[PDB]
């Protein structure tokens, strides 16, 4: 499983990881970003939510906006 | 629609295709400019823009996708690849990549890649677990590439003589020593035709370094496979780039357990271009360090124990009245395991194959033949030894002109 | 754990070993990078990693430990040695060191030495007092190295003729003169098989200088000793570096009273590499000062009077069409005490081993053989003298295949 | 008493302590410990020593007895 995302959606996201920028996604109904790694052919998005290191999967992403960037992963 | 189909269309139809789309006079620009304009106009449908190409990585970190129909010439219709994707997919120079591209947003000059579909005609997560090329072990040619066909013809005599003189296997490193105007291009064309007919499972590559445009057109219209060439109008860096691209593509293909064959014309002029380009001791005009890169090229041929093969058949020039050619030929002597000599004397009398029989031969013939065939070949070789060049060639032609398949000719000497 | 046990396993098992440790994508890299990554990931347990190597002191003052499995090629997985340790243990290039290693500290690039356990397979304080190789005195050979095995097979018919023509002792300096295509590679492999089976107490070392890639993997799976080589697609500086490390390592073993044997492929190729690396009288292209280093390598063969030995058998190429190879062979004429010639005429009639018997011989034969044997060989030499080359070879081959040993052939000659 | 040699790691850093005439706290590896002034190190009959300049008087300290070399830069060691 784990349908891969578009290169353009993985480019800005990887560029957003630099300079410790924040994101906008908490519930599925402000958040610090840390880095993004891959394991067993599956990429993950490690975020430092006030000490909590949550592993958000890119395949299960609702949306991603910002005060300067805005983009809707397809 | 498809970039590949667009590149494979004559310019006359390409002009009328863009005239129907509201575009003005495109008849006075170059082909790639027309392609770029047509692509830029047809930028409304969110899908149906597909592209593929071979990857070249620049020293800055970003890469480009190039096309073989222009012989990997840089231009306005290349496809940009970001370093992030290179890190993502473990990409390397020489990889063939297919997928979808997108128009340049603003402040950019090139189309960019959107989604990767195939890498090296395989799934992206399957083509990142293959072992490298200096990681495999080489063996001898324990296999055989037969050249002679069955039908009785005149063009088959050359193939039959070649089969009788020097057998060829998968993984060979062969050399052809040719004086001027001795019929070498016909030899290369005959070998290419025989390979195309007999073995359709291999990948054929033809490389031309410093030719003339008419020869390029003839070779492109005659050969069933890939033909890549550069003319003498272009600088030497172009020759170097073409050679490196071809060798890297061949290596990446061999990594997948394939069989690749390369036909190289005038390794001498490749060495000359490398001498021109390489920074500056002297041994008669050439730099000592200038010959390092070409030898690496010639050193890539081997038989892989894990599966796959890379065969290289190269041409060398002699008797051109230049010290550089003699030095290059003397340095490259003894590196291969197959030799084929051509003679000017036979060519002056208008004898077709013009092959010097007593000088040719291959190492390790015992592995490419059976016992009976080796015995018959030794018996034949014993008779020709006292004869002269023209006498031996006339004898061989006269005897071979009767029966076919190189079997009935061996039963006619009982 | 162990560096030696890690460099010997194939890359396919190394990839699985790395994957069973939580490593990321290391299948598209070279062997040395995978080894370095595996070493760095296992660095989480003090005092666990072992190591060994051969020291090469650089001109800046520090040294490196290199391995024989890569033909002493510099890589990221070498072991750094500081000048303080060199001063502390009185070390020289060519020394073999085994001990402990430690991970690289932040800011450094290489693993470093932690504790010295053995130097030249001895205690560090015991290898501190050994007289230098240039302070020993040389004499003629005494003990003989017999090649005959007394089996009765076909491969023994070369060793028996070798024993009849040119006996070899401990400390010889022999030269083999060979024309192209006369079975010079099959003769060298026959000598290596006779030494490993008859004299297992000696240290065997084979060295190739400009071989083809497929000829290196074949000799590495046949010789029961240490094989080191460099291919033709490498620089001239890499040919010189491989030869300096093999002669320095042999002198270090003769100081512990041992017997070492070196089989050098072609001394003509080593002299060509020194002519391209030494600063600019080019006699026939060969600088007069570019023949001093090669004569220093060949002149180290001798029989020590305090104990130990060093025998060297090199090959000289002749009749190749090069004016440089004829100038090099004329300079190394009259420097050896043993000589074996090869005839192309005998190899054209498919007769092996083709040893010109009327031109080969050794100096001071009386010291290596008993009186009766010398008389029998004198009788044989007188008998064979008037015959021709091919005739004498056929006569010897016919006569030697009726008995099992040379003693039974001398009593049958009555 | 056969004098078991010390590691190649401590030696190198102890060879840098000899340079620039630093002040450490080596003393003995029983209970005795206070100041000194390492100046150089030499060998004799397969035995190493450390020549210092503690208040003029120069003694010979073995490397198989030192337990630590507390000095602002190079401080910690067990051997």
Structure commentary:
This is part of a larger assembly, with two copies of chain A and two copies of chain B (414 residues). Chain A is α+β, with helices and mostly antiparallel strands and 74 residues long. In chain A, 15% of the residues lie in helices and 34% in strands. Chain A has one helix spanning 7-17; strands spanning 22-23, 31-32, 35-38, 43-49, 52-57, 64-65, 70-71. In chain A, strand 6 and strand 7 (70-71) form a beta hairpin. Chain B has 414 residues and is an alpha/beta fold. Chain B folds into two domains: 1-126, OB fold (Dihydrolipoamide Acetyltransferase, E2P), CATH 2.40.50; 129-414, P-loop containing nucleotide triphosphate hydrolases (Rossmann fold), CATH 3.40.50.300. Chain B has 14 helices and 14 strands. In chain B, strands 6, 7, 8, 9, 10, 11, 12, 13 and 14 form a nine-stranded mixed beta sheet that branches. In chain B, strands 1-2-3-5-4 form a five-stranded mixed barrel. In chain B, strand 4 (96-102) and strand 5 form a beta hairpin. The longest helix of chain B has 19 residues, at 236-254. Chain B starts with a helix and ends in a 14-residue tail after the last helix. The interface between B and C is medium-sized, with 30 and 24 residues.
Number of separate domains of chain B = 2
The CATH superfamily of the largest domain in chain B bears the name: P-loop containing nucleotide triphosphate hydrolases
Number of strands of chain B: 14
Enter the CATH topology name of the largest domain in chain B. Rossmann fold
Helix content of chain B: 25-40%
Q: What's the CATH class of the largest domain in chain B, please?
A: Alpha Beta
Cα-atom Rg of chain B, whole angstroms? 24 Å
Q: Looking at the structure, what is the overall shape of chain B?
A: elongated
Number of strands of chain A: 7
Give helix and strand order of chain A, one letter per element, not per position.
HEEEEEEE
Broad structural category of chain B? alpha/beta
Distance between the termini of chain B: 65 Å
Q: Name the chain pair with the biggest interface and residue counts per chain.
A: B-C, 30 and 24 residues
PDB class: transcription
Keywords: Rho-dependent termination, transcription
Entry title: Structural mechanism of inhibition of the Rho transcription termination factor by Rof
Chains A, D: Protein rof
């Amino acid at each position: 499983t784990y349908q891969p995302i578009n290169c353009d959606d993985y480019d800005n996201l990887e560029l957003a990881c630099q300079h410790h920028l924040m994101l906008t996604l908490e519930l599925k109904d402000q958040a610090k970003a840390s880095d993004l790694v891959s394991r067993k052919n599956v990429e993950y998005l490690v975020v430092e939510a006030a000490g909590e290191t949550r592993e958000l999967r890119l395949d299960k992403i609702t949306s991603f906006s910002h005060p300067e960037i805005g983009t809707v992963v397809v | 629609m498809n970039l590949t189909e667009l590149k494979n269309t004559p310019v006359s139809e390409l002009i009328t295709l863009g005239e129907n789309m509201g575009l003005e006079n495109l008849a006075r620009m170059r082909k790639q400019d027309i392609i770029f304009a047509i692509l830029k106009q047809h930028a409304k449908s969110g899908e149906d823009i597909f592209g593929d190409g071979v990857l070249e990585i620049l020293q800055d970190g970003f890469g480009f996708l190039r096309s073989a129909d222009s012989s990997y010439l840089a231009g306005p219709d290349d496809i940009y690849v970001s370093p992030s994707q290179i890190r993502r997919f473990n990409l390397r120079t020489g990889d063939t990549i297919s997928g979808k591209i997108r128009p340049p947003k603003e402040g950019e000059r090139y189309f960019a890649l959107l989604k990767v579909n195939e890498v090296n005609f395989d799934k992206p997560e399957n083509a990142r677990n293959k072992i490298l090329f200096e990681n495999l072990t080489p063996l001898h040619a324990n296999s055989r590439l037969r050249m002679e066909r069955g039908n009785g013809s005149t063009e088959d005599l050359t193939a039959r003589v070649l089969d009788l003189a020097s057998p060829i296997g998968r993984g060979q490193r062969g050399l052809i020593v040719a004086p001027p105007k001795a019929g070498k291009t016909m030899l290369l064309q005959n070998i290419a035709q025989s390979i195309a007919y007999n073995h359709p499972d291999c990948v054929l590559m033809v490389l031309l370094i410093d030719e003339r445009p008419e020869e390029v057109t003839e070779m492109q219209r005659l050969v069933k496979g890939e033909v890549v060439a550069s003319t003498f109008d272009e600088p030497a860096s172009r020759h170097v780039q073409v050679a490196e691209m071809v060798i890297e593509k061949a290596k990446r293909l061999v990594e997948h357990k394939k069989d690749v064959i390369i036909l190289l014309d005038s390794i001498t002029r490749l060495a000359r271009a490398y001498n021109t380009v390489v920074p500056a001791v002297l041994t008669g005009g050439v730099d000592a360090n200038a010959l390092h890169r070409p030898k690496r090229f010639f050193g890539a041929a081997r038989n892989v124990e894990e599966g796959g093969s890379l065969t290289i058949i190269a041409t060398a020039l002699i008797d051109t009245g230049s010290k550089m050619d003699e030095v290059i030929y003397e340095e490259f002597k003894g590196t291969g395991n197959m030799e084929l000599h051509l003679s000017r004397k036979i060519a002056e009398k208008r004898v077709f194959p013009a092959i010097d029989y007593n000088r040719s031969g291959t190492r390790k013939e015992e592995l490419l033949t059976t016992q009976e065939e080796l015995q018959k070949m030794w018996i034949l070789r014993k008779i020709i030894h006292p004869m002269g060049e023209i006498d031996a060639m006339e004898f061989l032609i006269n005897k071979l002109a009767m029966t076919k398949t190189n079997d009935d000719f061996f039963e006619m000497m009982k």
